[PDB]
Design a protein around this ligand. Structure first.
Ligand SMILES: O=C1CSc2cc(C(=O)O)ccc2N1
Length: 167
């Protein structure tokens, strides 16, 4: 049994809810919240900008030190950093950004990072300002992630379309 409330069950392991990931993180304090990161961990906008704002920029300060030491992530890759006031850990995952021309086949590689964590609160990778089709992102999630994933969807309209169209 876990703390997550109000989710619709899509599969054995994937759950979905219309909710703000930040407000959901603040309420649940999950072991892992996933960030929709870029390779530079520059948390300017979208989910990343909202998570970072909710940490009062502490996520960005920590991320800048990580990049100064390790250099950029790979598209499809990830790193584990603090969850600050939102979660125990933040898994920063880089999905391909279609608005930069990145290979959408890298979306499966991105979701494979989730399998290293038994339970996660996450957004749909490569959705929103990363430019991918969120219906496609949900399909790759269900067909790739085997651990228990609780998906938070920003837009109510999109949430209802994802559920209604789910196979
Ligand atoms: O508070 C906010 C507004 S910014 C924001 C954007 C997104 C998104 O782009 O999916 C998700 C949650 C978000 N939380």
């Amino acid at each position: 049994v876990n703390s997550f409330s109000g989710y619709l069950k899509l599969t054995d392991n994937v759950y979905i809810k219309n909710a703000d990931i930040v407000e959901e993180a603040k309420k649940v304090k999950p072991t892992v919240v996933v960030n929709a990161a870029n390779v530079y961990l520059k948390h300017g906008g979208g989910v990343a900008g909202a998570l970072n704002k909710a940490t009062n920029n502490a996520m960005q300060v920590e991320s800048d030190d990580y990049i100064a030491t390790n250099g950029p992530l790979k598209v499809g890759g990830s790193c584990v950093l603090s969850g600050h006031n939102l979660a125990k850990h933040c898994l920063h995952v880089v999905g391909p950004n279609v608005n930069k021309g990145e290979d959408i086949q890298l979306l499966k590689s991105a979701y494979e990072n989730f399998n290293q964590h038994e339970v996660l609160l996450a957004p749909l990778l490569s959705a929103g300002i990363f430019g991918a089709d969120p219906i496609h992102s949900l399909r790759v999630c269900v067909d790739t992630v085997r651990t228990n994933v609780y998906l938070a969807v920003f837009d109510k309209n999109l949430y209802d379309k994802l559920v209604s169209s789910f196979l």
